[PDB]
Design a protein around this ligand. Structure first.
Ligand SMILES: CC[C@H](C)[C@H](N)C(=O)O
Lengths: 334, 336
């Protein structure tokens, strides 16, 4: 029961973008204490909120913008633009601030107000579109802006841009190195699908046998061929199959109910002291469901945790008060 | 010009407490581009929001609870208690969750309701006290519970606990290591003073000549012997000299005005893309003022950044919008 904190990094970073990646892989113990999850089975969570702006999208905003600059797709005098009301817009504002590019984020005026403030703090221009029109309204205005100003804008295009997927070759390498090649199964909740496919690509290059599991809301199970539907797992369930998705790289898809995802996240912060977001709740429950299968005994399971619960305080994540013991909570989840 | 992201940690952490510390030391560039700051001077920020709950206090809550467990001051059956409405509360809740101890946090019922929800998520019991009584009301209640329940509670006592100061021997080692011994000046905005003293204690062992600079609100300059007063630099300016403060380890104290601290933090996010909190605004401004002094040319200046601006969205930090170009903003901040 000796407990050592982290050693010095022994690096001086040249700017904040160099602190992106190399996120920690942490053992779960509290939510894994269940008679069906066997002793040898290892359940690890990769905590992407250790990134400078606390989400997986940091890797994406950075790679998209940096590659575009190296490529000549983004050049001085041009501006970045994207329709997004989430973590991607924040990641793009961070990259844009460092590189010295104006960043334009379009989103329905109904959204965030807090993420709006984050994006403005970074110096972003916000393009608040008509609330009723939702994200299609934001996309529409960006298209209108590109058309009216040819040559001026670089569109991030998070669902169609392969520099998204490619960023997660680093995510995969970290998993490989950190588990010393022992990883057996990776679980990733799917938004753009950059994580699941980019991780899958790279890991399957390392070891064909690795099982890759995508997670999506049961209420909007589009990867499994269902229709787009309302759901409350923020960050995932985009309602279409992203163009960067590659089904060949995904071995199984697990649908998780919105309410279960939230309830899992509540249990994780309570019993492991890890304050994960909503989509993490879904990924972790899927991973726990894998860990209880007899054919998975002794395997190493890695679960992506894309964001931190702090970004969800204005939501319903921590409203519901679950009852029963820990074993009771976990039984109702499984 | 090559930007390289971080390499794999090559470690599997047994639990989240093992990810505390080893925070990154990052160069500032955008906010250092002012004629009075010399090219050779290195201005670095140590980003304590890389801790798992996003503040320097993760170290403190961890070490307080860990040492108490190792010493026998915290034993199965007892509960943790503290009156705090800041980051220390969250740090204690995380430590408590992992070690398997109950955490009781007392604060005024009207303060940091975001932070309230964070704490309840970790399973903490909140002791919400009368709003208009503020922090002395929460302390009074904790004193009451302590008195009526002798032996039940372990009080963190962040302002008086040497385990707070001792945690920053790690902070100091990271600074020493990361700069390969080249650190010349450390700038730290003072709340409990755990950071500035614990860092000074350890670094002054390494090398004669490391200047240690404390930072406090201009409106409440108690370290400098002025009277307590109202200020808006959250996390610092406690209004008294903490029991763990040791003036002999501090070379200079810099007062910073609230509105300047905020304006600095706004400039840092906008021009360096680093979303630092209010007290970081204060420390960075003090550090840039140091970087201006001709005797400091070519020196390595390390500035502690205790928290991320995202924890401040409800405050006026980003509500006030600065007119003017980068150079006008920086010039207005170094004004005098
Ligand atoms: C001086 C105030 C301190 C730093 C703060 N209230 C905290 O405990 O987090």
């Amino acid at each position: 029961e000796q407990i050592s904190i982290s050693s010095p990094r022994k690096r001086i970073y040249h700017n904040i973008l160099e602190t992106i990646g190399g996120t920690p892989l942490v053992e779960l113990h509290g939510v894994t204490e269940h008679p069906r999850i066997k002793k040898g089975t290892r359940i690890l969570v990769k905590l992407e909120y250790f990134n400078p702006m606390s989400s997986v999208k940091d890797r994406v905003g950075f790679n998209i913008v940096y590659q575009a600059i190296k490529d000549g797709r983004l050049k001085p005098g041009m501006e970045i633009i994207e329709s997004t009301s989430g973590n991607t817009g924040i990641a793009l504002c961070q990259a844009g601030a460092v590189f010295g590019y104006r960043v334009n984020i379009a989103m329905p005026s109904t959204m965030s107000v807090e993420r709006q403030m984050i994006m403005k703090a970074f110096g972003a221009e916000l393009i608040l579109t008509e609330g009723k029109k939702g994200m299609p309204g934001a996309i529409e205005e960006v298209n209108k802006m590109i058309k009216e100003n040819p040559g001026k804008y670089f569109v991030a295009n998070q669902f169609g841009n392969p520099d998204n997927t490619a960023a997660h070759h680093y995510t995969a390498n970290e998993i490989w190195e950190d588990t010393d090649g022992e990883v057996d199964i990776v679980v990733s909740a799917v938004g753009t699908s950059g994580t699941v496919i980019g991780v899958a690509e790279k890991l399957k290059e390392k070891k064909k046998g690795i099982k890759i599991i995508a997670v999506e809301p049961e209420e909007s199970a589009v990867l499994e061929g269902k229709a787009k539907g309302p759901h409350g797992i923020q960050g995932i369930g985009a309602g279409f199959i992203p163009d960067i998705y590659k089904k060949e790289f995904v071995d199984e898809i697990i649908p998780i109910k919105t309410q279960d995802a939230w309830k899992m996240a509540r249990a994780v912060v309570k019993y492991d002291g890890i304050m994960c977001g909503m989509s993490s709740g879904a990924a972790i429950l899927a991973g726990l469901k894998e860990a209880e299968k007899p054919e998975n005994e002794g395997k190493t399971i890695v679960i992506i945790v894309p964001s931190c619960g702090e970004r969800y305080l204005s939501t319903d994540l921590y409203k519901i008060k679950d009852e029963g013991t820990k074993i009771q909570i976990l039984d109702s989840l499984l």
